[PDB]
């Protein structure tokens, strides 16, 4: 799940 | 029974000593020492590269003082004598005596590059230029505190009968404008509590029964004040008639409690100086005496933070314990989304009316929007993990970027919430249709 | 020494008993019973057919309560625990705990289909969604009462150092808009009657130091309140804050006194619930316990009537003595015209801003207009009998229908006032010109 | 402690006698005498040409009175009995008795050409037309004083729980409009002196527990009031709420101090009557009792002046025995410039909104502007003689006519300041360009 917020960070 | 008393921003009492600080701010600090039947006054600066520290002997007993980047203003509450000293040698020092009535005293003073202002216990307001040329006289309730920025002036008043009130006005070059006039002021009051009869507390309330420590305009020209409960209060929406409101933006007691490890370190106190973006400039005082001591301790800084915190929950979540207590992701995300929203709105108001004062605020604003959506995405993912479709959908409406909604769709899919995926896709389609208008 | 309290509208103390009511309104009532160190809470409705009555055990000591058509909200003022219970099972029952400072307590709570609000003794305002997600935090004068309808919220504030005051605001989707904020309240405090501290009364005022039985919005969305004066007060012109004014629209002491035949009986009291057009919905209480008791009586109704009479003159005009007083035509027509005027104006404001809420109000307004002119015609005819040409002509200007003006011509002819006949027909000509234009 | 009482404009107590003044204004005054169980009333006019002095007997013991050039209004505060008397015979007098709650009493009354107003201790407001037809009832703070001039009405209100406040309204026959509604009032209270001094003037404070000595509208409708400190206050900029402000325009004590040669002739008291443009109409009373008696002594006239002086400084400047103290020319010129400025602004506002009454007031405004520049030229020349070019240049900006600027050039030449001649001529050229534009 955190990886999707990583996408929103990238 | 009650008695009105003079005030200077962030000045200390004497304590059991022959010396004190008269006023302290972002420009500098003014300190004085007794020498027989006289006093020596020193003007010190936090930029003695621009400025020069200087000192002189006071034979008048100037009990009031105010400092800015042009000069220093001095006043005597009983005799009515005042004196202004430019820091430069281009323009001269000068003095004047104000026509006080019997039983009247000057309560506070202020100075800007365009004006000099005096207020009294009997509520008389008098204004002059930087050479002492008089302009007008006006009547209010008894005035208890003053501060100013260019043409903006912020005043506090008190009456046994009308209560506590404030006024906000601008001495505009066309005319004087009142934004608020003696509207009620919401500060907490200490003196009713018997615990205030502690020695260090009692001296301050003899020195300053109001319990205010300082007041100033923000780095964006908004009124701010630090009161008896050690909370920083900021007037929000002051440019809006139907929305102006006081916001508690920082509890220093909570920060000390957390930063001390969840501990009741009442041996620590905070002395405020000035506000710069989200961070307050202050002195951290330690010991019995709640005011800073001699020689002056070093400047410190602290961030503003929203009051989400519960001690018991934070202790349980946290459970070398002096280290600052752990904050859950839910609390951190909630506090960030509130703080990001508040900061963005205040900064938006600044840029819409004051413009870019520093030349980087659009960048800060963009970062704040990213932080806002990211915090909401954390809370959204928590709602999805709780399988609460309605709460997740309501949180999805708060997200700004379509990129954020794309992330929310993927979160919803992995949360196995196809109904939420469909409804967010409807929202994305609706927003794209709105963007196509 | 004064002390702050938690409160909820139209609930009751225990007296010496093991049971009390937490809140009551036109939709229903909340009651509770003590079971050793545990309590049973029951939610009852005046339509139990639509809404299931339900009950549950309170293991927390919920001391705050609020009831609406969707659910019931409960709160614990010391622990900060709160709980919301929808009447249906589509929406979940949920609980939350709110942060509180040392010695701080929740003073009041409120909830609508679009907003949720919490207030504390230290003057902090907190707002949430229907799931308990926080929206904002604000600092005010200490909050003592709350009420709401859709986005519209009304609040009461009190401090010895800021006075007694109220706020009116609308928490809209655009922003929180203030109509009035902490403006002075024109209501008689119960402690003005300091000498009435009998044992039975003292228990009630220890339970409710404010004395107010309830505060609510009208059927037309107007703020209303009932205080220690035993009089219902309504805020007029609230939609136009430049023009706002409080109106005393019904005195229960006068009505019960008249209903007893003009007698000072010390035995019956009114418990208000809500105002529906011209009629107060209320419960009649009897004896020393001025608060209602168990089992709850069936509701009653009472019409609003203006405070425009003299007791001694009424008794002398009345001169079976328990039957309600025979009022003169002059007094009756006077009060009728005033009440018709007030009701027509308030309903006009309702319809001009919020439209027909029930779909028939135009008929009500037309009926009020007929009653208004008929009342004026009675007063006009009395003036003509007195042969006061000037007063008669002044009354003619206040009529609204040309039929009434024509009737006034006939009355003037019967009164043998040809000058008045001429001038009335000049007025009819002027109004005919206005009708042509 | 405070208690509510009736009032009327500039009445007197009975004292040791069986007679007293009920009220005074510019038009006239009213007196009454007690005859065992009855009273005799007398009405006086200063316009002996326009009106007839007359008398009549009262059996009811009126204690309230209000006068205008249309008629006189009378009231009884305990019984609620009232009477209105036109000055003409044609419209016969009429009477009414008003309902009152237990212990309630009428505090003040007032009347316009078509409106009648009554206020009470319990904060109830009631209103009627010139023929007693009721219009409306409203609930406010308790009222303590009322005054009116044509359609403009000025009210004062006070409560323990809401402070001191005022209202301003205009009862236009086109429409009724409010300019201020119970907004805070900065007036000086007398209670401390009444509680501490024990001066044997306690009867006056019993007679007038507010200590508001008198209040009236100016000769051009400005609201004015005379304080317990014996100072005259006027409300400026009332047409503009963000600019409206209270101005102290005359201190009677300072005048008597100078008049006596700097001495404390406390045996002398000033009783105000009315304000005519720039001049106070007043009685100079001598002896034990601080108010006048019968037969009426002749009035006096006295000009307003700005509070700028200091006793000790003027004694030093001064240093046949009662000769009035000599003043520095700087103080005189400064006071004149301030007084000219305030007078011109008030007159300008009057002309801007209400125009000329007589066709010549613009000439007075021109004279005030001439006096203003003349005063500034003297102050400017002093600054030039001191060689303070900075202050002299700052003063030069405030001069209006190029005649004065040309004189300033000559003054600068006498001061031998070619730099200031240059910069004045730069200003004159810049202002000539602005005049050409």
UniProtKB/Swiss-Prot annotation, chain A:
Any idea where this protein resides? Nucleus
Q: Which domain of life is it from?
A: Eukaryota
Additional observations = In eukaryotes there are five DNA polymerases: alpha, beta, gamma, delta, and epsilon which are responsible for different reactions of DNA synthesis.
Q: Please state which protein family the record places this protein in.
A: Belongs to the DNA polymerase type-B family.
Q: What does this protein do?
A: Catalytic component of DNA polymerase alpha, which in complex with DNA primase (DNA polymerase alpha:primase) constitutes a replicative polymerase. POL1 has a role in promoting telomere replication during interaction with CDC13.
Q: What is known of its domains?
A: The CysA-type zinc finger is required for PCNA-binding.
- How does this polypeptide assemble, per the annotation? DNA polymerase alpha:primase is a four subunit enzyme complex, which is assembled throughout the cell cycle, and consists of the two DNA polymerase subunits A POL1 and B POL12, and the DNA primase large PRI2 and small PRI1 subunits. Subunit B POL12 binds to subunit A POL1. POL1 interacts with CDC13, POB3, SPT16 and MCM10.
Its protein name is: DNA polymerase alpha catalytic subunit A
**What gene is it encoded by?**
POL1
Q: Which stretch of the full-length chain is present here?
A: 140 to 149 of 1468
UniProtKB/Swiss-Prot annotation, chains B, C, D:
The entry's other comment says: Present with 3280 molecules/cell in log phase SD medium.
What exactly does this protein do? Accessory factor for DNA replication. It plays a role in accurately duplicating the genome in vivo.
Organism this protein belongs to: Saccharomyces cerevisiae (strain ATCC 204508 / S288c)
Organism lineage string: Eukaryota, Fungi, Dikarya, Ascomycota, Saccharomycotina
Q: Where in the cell is it found?
A: Nucleus
Q: Where are the WD repeats?
A: 227-267
* Protein name as it appears in the record: DNA polymerase alpha-binding protein
